Ligand binder design. Structure first.
Ligand SMILES: CC(=O)NCC1CCN(Cc2cc(CN3CCN(c4ccncc4)CC3)cc(-c3cc(Cl)cc(Cl)c3)c2)CC1
Ligand SMILES: *[C@@H]1O[C@H](CO)[C@@H](O)[C@H](O)[C@H]1NC(C)=O
Ligand SMILES: [Ca+2]
Ligand SMILES: [Ca+2]
Ligand SMILES: [Ca+2]
Ligand SMILES: [Cl-]
Ligand code: NA
Ligand code: NA
Ligand code: NA
Ligand code: NA
Length: 471
């Protein structure tokens, strides 16, 4: 195997490193996996399809302009180069290799397109038409953005966009399911908590956070239990950043944020799908859980879950490992059909006050076709009123003892509107047996005499009843 000769490949430290602080992508390339035959689409502000490092891999069938309603996602050029982000992300996935231009994509033989959908009013219809673009041609969708990362918003896909997610994972990709890769958010300095973003909090998105070059939680990171895994991105000014294609046929060394991490994950997932084109959308999440690596990622919340995996709310299961992903993909056995066990918990509404604990022992649908002994995602779907939402912290403890933070205190969130059947999701109990006692904790983190009521708590378990590995 000959590594890429591109002039900036040495600067792509998160691919080219020899110090073990990388995504182990060279290992996958040397196994023969470069993304050939895989199609990725960047949902963003457009894609410069004539960029010298993108043209060779550009795919019009992976592209559309939902903002102006035409097939051509070319960016709108402006004096501040506002609409450059999709081009940056496209190159992360699939910049052409060995062509003397900039660097390379993770999946430098994949086909790459873009949906121009952020340069205009983003409505539910816009979102749905983007997520649902050509779902039997595009394999993987990469989305770096969502509701405002202001630390006070709770929002998610409205009806058309949620329908697009379920159509995508159900019928997309020939029934194997569209793979939606999402950035968990850039709201760190606003103390944002990413389960309040219903796109990344969805089970249908494979959500990705960031690590700095020195292995730290970047200033912009949002912690939450819905995150699955991590890729490198930017940090402080002594740490390197992401190197990729830029608007106006240029090359940037200063692509940043969690919004730069999701495309790298999309590229790794493209390599993995080349290694096994039969993987379902859930198979892909299983591979990420099993192969991702905590080592050398610094966080004060690493915890071992009930099946012996370390998990963090900043990093999920750790750094994606492309070589491990493609290796495990090749002989992966398709997971069983997804089961869903619905448990209505409360017998009566509960005053929250300063603190509320709800304990419930469940059988996880014992005796039923939705009996789950092997958890995937779990949700606590909560309906509650409270006078100042951001003073709440919410935790969910599984029978195996795994304490998932569903909501951290959000100091800017002054809302008195509470949560209306909000489906807080955790990945941290993946592969655990969910039978037994679950505990929901709701706490007022402020000294104020806050008040409200929990009126509904639905525990929703997803998973299967066969095929577990030894912890
Ligand atoms: C009841 C009802 O109809 N509510 C409709 C709302 C519509 C709205 N969304 C939430 C939302 C909002 C927005 C819009 N923001 C996102 C950031 N951005 C920039 C970021 C950086 N520089 C320049 C621009 C544009 C401004 C972008 C998405 C979204 C994003 C992607 Cl990448 C993929 C997909 Cl699918 C979505 C999502 C919630 C539902
Ligand atoms: C894909 O997986 C399904 C489910 O196990 C199986 O029925 C089918 O034969 C597989 N197809 C290929 C081409 O491997
Ligand atoms: Ca256009
Ligand atoms: Ca190149
Ligand atoms: Ca956020
Ligand atoms: Cl469902
Ligand atoms: Na965001
Ligand atoms: Na997700
Ligand atoms: Na534990
Ligand atoms: Na149990």
């Amino acid at each position: 195997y000959q590594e890429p000769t591109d002039p900036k490949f040495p600067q792509q430290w998160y691919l080219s490193g020899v110090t073990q602080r990388d995504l182990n992508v060279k290992a996958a390339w040397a196994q023969g996996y470069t993304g050939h035959g895989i199609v990725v689409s960047i949902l963003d502000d457009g894609i410069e399809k004539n960029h010298p490092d993108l043209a060779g891999n550009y795919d019009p069938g992976a592209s559309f302009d939902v903002n102006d309603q035409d097939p051509d996602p070319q960016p709108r050029y402006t004096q501040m180069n506002d609409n450059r982000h999709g081009t940056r992300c496209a190159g992360e996935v699939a910049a052409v290799a060995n062509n003397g231009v900039c660097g390379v994509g993770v999946a430098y033989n994949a086909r790459i397109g873009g949906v121009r959908m952020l340069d205009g009013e983003v409505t539910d219809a816009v979102e749905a038409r983007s997520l649902g673009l050509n779902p039997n041609h595009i394999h993987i969708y990469s989305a770096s953005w969502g509701p405002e990362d202001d630390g006070k918003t709770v929002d998610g896909p409205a009806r058309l966009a949620e329908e697009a997610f379920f159509r995508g994972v159900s019928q997309g990709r020939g029934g194997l399911g569209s793979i939606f890769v999402w950035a968990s958010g850039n709201g760190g300095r606003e103390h944002d908590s990413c389960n309040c973003d219903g796109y990344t909090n969805s089970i249908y998105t494979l959500s990705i956070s960031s690590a700095t070059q020195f292995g730290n939680v970047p200033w912009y990171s949002e912690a939450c239990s819905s995150t699955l895994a991590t890729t490198y991105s930017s940090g402080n000014q002594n740490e390197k950043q992401i190197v990729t294609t830029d608007l106006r046929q240029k090359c940037t060394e200063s692509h940043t944020g969690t919004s730069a991490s999701a495309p790298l994950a999309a590229g790794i997932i493209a390599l993995t799908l080349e290694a096994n084109k039969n993987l379902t959308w859930r198979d892909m999440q299983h591979l990420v859980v099993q192969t991702s690596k905590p080592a050398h990622l610094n966080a004060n919340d690493w915890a071992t879950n009930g099946v012996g995996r370390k998990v963090s709310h900043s990093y999920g299961y750790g750094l994606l490992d492309a070589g491990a992903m493609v290796a495990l993909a090749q002989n992966w056995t398709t997971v069983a059909p997804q089961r869903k066990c619905i448990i209505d918990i409360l017998t009566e509404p509960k005053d929250i006050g300063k603190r509320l604990e709800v304990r419930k022992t469940v059988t996880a649908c014992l005796g039923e076709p939705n009996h789950i002994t092997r958890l995937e995602h779990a949700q606590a779907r909560l309906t509650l009123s409270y006078n100042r939402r951001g003073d709440l912290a919410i935790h969910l403890v599984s029978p195996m003892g795994t304490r998932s933070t569903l909501l951290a205190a959000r100091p800017h969130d002054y809302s008195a509107d509470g949560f209306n059947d909000w489906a807080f999701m955790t990945t941290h109990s993946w592969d655990e047996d969910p039978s037994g006692e679950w505990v929901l904790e709701i706490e007022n983190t402020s000294e104020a005499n806050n008040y409200g009521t929990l009126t509904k708590f639905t525990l929703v378990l997803y998973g299967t009843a066969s095929g577990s590995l030894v912890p």
